[PDB]
Amino acid sequence: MVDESDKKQQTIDEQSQISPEKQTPNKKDKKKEEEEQLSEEDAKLKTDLELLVERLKEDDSSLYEASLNALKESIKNSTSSMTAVPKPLKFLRPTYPDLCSIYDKWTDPNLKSSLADVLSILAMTYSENGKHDSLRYRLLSDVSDFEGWGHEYIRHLALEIGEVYNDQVEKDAEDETSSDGSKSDGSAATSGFEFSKEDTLRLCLDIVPYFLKHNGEEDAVDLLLEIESIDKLPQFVDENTFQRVCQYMVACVPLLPPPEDVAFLKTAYSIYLSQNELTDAIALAVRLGEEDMIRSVFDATSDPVMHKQLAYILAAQKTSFEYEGVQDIIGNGKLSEHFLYLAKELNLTGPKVPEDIYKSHLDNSKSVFSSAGLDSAQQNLASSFVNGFLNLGYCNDKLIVDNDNWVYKTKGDGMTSAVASIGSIYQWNLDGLQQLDKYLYVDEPEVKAGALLGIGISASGVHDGEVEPALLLLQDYVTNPDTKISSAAILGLGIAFAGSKNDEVLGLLLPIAASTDLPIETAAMASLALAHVFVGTCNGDITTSIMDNFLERTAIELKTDWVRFLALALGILYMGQGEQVDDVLETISAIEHPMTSAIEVLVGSCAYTGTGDVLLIQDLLHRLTPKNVKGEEDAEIKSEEKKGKSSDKDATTDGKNDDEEEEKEAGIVDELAYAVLGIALIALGEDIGKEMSLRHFGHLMHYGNEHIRRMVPLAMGIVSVSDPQMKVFDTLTRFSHDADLEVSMNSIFAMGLCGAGTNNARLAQLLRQLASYYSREQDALFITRLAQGLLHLGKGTMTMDVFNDAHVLNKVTLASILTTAVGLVSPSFMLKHHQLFYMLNAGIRPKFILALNDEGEPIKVNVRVGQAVETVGQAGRPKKITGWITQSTPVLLNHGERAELETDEY
């Protein structure tokens, strides 16, 4: 440290720690006297650079501060940075660290502030040279180790980040602001940013998201594509690149409300497309929900290869996975045109092959019955629905149904729902139609109507490839003028096709849903069906639905139930979009009534989805307001008010649910809670309001996909035994279902205690019984999620009928609706060319460790489990493929996706 002169080269370094003699006196004097001596300075630049490098190792603040103190002055005091024009410009390389030594190494508040501004200007001017890039680089990849650079290099990088962010907030931009003093754009800093990005991508990760999003343009993202696609395999593997990308969309997913969010995720899709794996491509294309992006990946395998190859099989698998059936319709018919084989290809895309694999899983799952043996009165009705609820999905319980004794003892609305429950035994199955047919041609109209509902449920697993579509059966019934018959028919058609908006299905539903002049309560199903059809894909926000809602309000207000169902139907219709839904909020609000205000708060949730924090706060001010106005005064109306209050509560929960899914998974723990206080609250907000918030909570959890499933449903449940409306229990169980018999051991006991214990009304008893059977599926047959499963950010289309029903007080009429509850997840199996129905091995992981994702890419250690197991729910969801040791390579990466495994054995 101490000066020991020029005795050897080692002690020259020690000499310049206190006072440099080759950077301070000599150089300073030289610059301030002769200008022939500019030639001597130029040679001495190289020497000066070396002395910095050697003393980088030294970290002490005092011996960088004082040493380079008079050089820091010289910039404006003696040199003035223009006494020899080029020469000070190219000698700004040693002087730039001198400024940083007062910024970061020494902290003097007055100078630390002031010289930040100076650093920005000189960074820009020296990046013209392109040597400011090289200045950054020697510290980014390092040459020496010291604590100092670890705080310092960031400051250089921060100059760029500063200005670019400021141009959005303050419209004036450029160097007009004195907060940077550097121009925002122009060909002098733009080339600096590109070069900087290159070095920082290789070694770091830091400044790359700040730059793209701060420009605010998709253009920034499209520059990124170029650099990364080079890097895809030689620099590092495909996998490392995928983890590098998906996050541009994810940190900044929640962080894109509609117009930006779509434009950024377009680019990520394209990056994946460019790279080797098309498997990553399909996942992002589904995400966007655009028809256009789906087609391009499907075409990419199908069209170029003339031969059948792997390519046709692979295309069919990829589109099959979404059980919305949106991909299914689009992908069909290309197979027909090409014509290698119609028979294998068409079946494989359709959900017909999913019926067959279910038999293999079922061969394992068998049957254990537990259904209620109660008969007579309302207890007969309870038991007969319960049988269907335990045998959801493909199950064989034919003989019990064929005993027509208990069937005929149902009465009223009970008959309709009894036949509907029979259909859920043969849910997702071609056979089952036979049982329904018997009743349909005999007795009163009530059994005829219930048959049509059951056809709907059964037709879910078979409606593609022109193999017994739901359309075929149900068209005749729509024609028939009876209201019960027609209403039942169009409900079942919507369920079966789900998100598919095929020409025949859509166009049948197109002239209708436009009569509401005639007062019919069960014409809720008119719009309700059409709304269900629309979800799963981008929405036209159809003019048929918007018109009829307004017309209904004009005609009637007597049937409170009718207008409440209608309001929800609009909000569910708009799901699958958010850009266009900003427009329609205004359109609805054009005509103003207090009744119309009820509709608006619902539609606000969908428009504002993919952010909600302006939405959240809004849906809370609303809650306060009823109380606020009566509150204010001391210091026909019935229908309008009630619609008003209820809509808001539903809207609050809905807003939260879509928001929690798409974006960061940690926050989910709290979002359930935004409700616990919401509930305590409403249970608190009005006497009337308490009734609504109870029911909403259960579907909050199911939609939101809470991590915790043990504590919160059970605890809430106890309080709500005392409280009226036993429909609370039904909504809790749809969440609790999980992976069956993990969560659900506690659930059956807890729900069973209140139900068995208390009988004081057979009406109250009925709701409790149905909820219990729903929760469990024998021998872990299937799971239900609201989510797609293909994306865990995703949201289904079949589960939207579940979400609808919790907005109203319980009714016998509502029981008919509740039979439908579709939303199946398939169990993965390793496929072959002969369609092998067994998985070899898999790893399951309860909790992803990887803090290189939210989703957590499944690691490679895992816990090993056997063949032919259901894809586990929460606390099992990350799933890695074990097959690599046995000479097998997955073709279709599976992370705990719905998607069936496919392997190529070598």
Partner: protein, 48 residues
Amino acid sequence: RCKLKLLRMERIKDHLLLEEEFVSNSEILKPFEKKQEEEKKQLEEIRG
């Protein structure tokens, strides 16, 4: 971006939750005013 994504969701939700419960403290006592409010008076006098 990989830490941030986690943070952005989870923080904003803990800030809202906290705020929610402040407005809500008052709101607990509102669905009653003699239905439970009265009950509370009766228990207390007994206790002293």
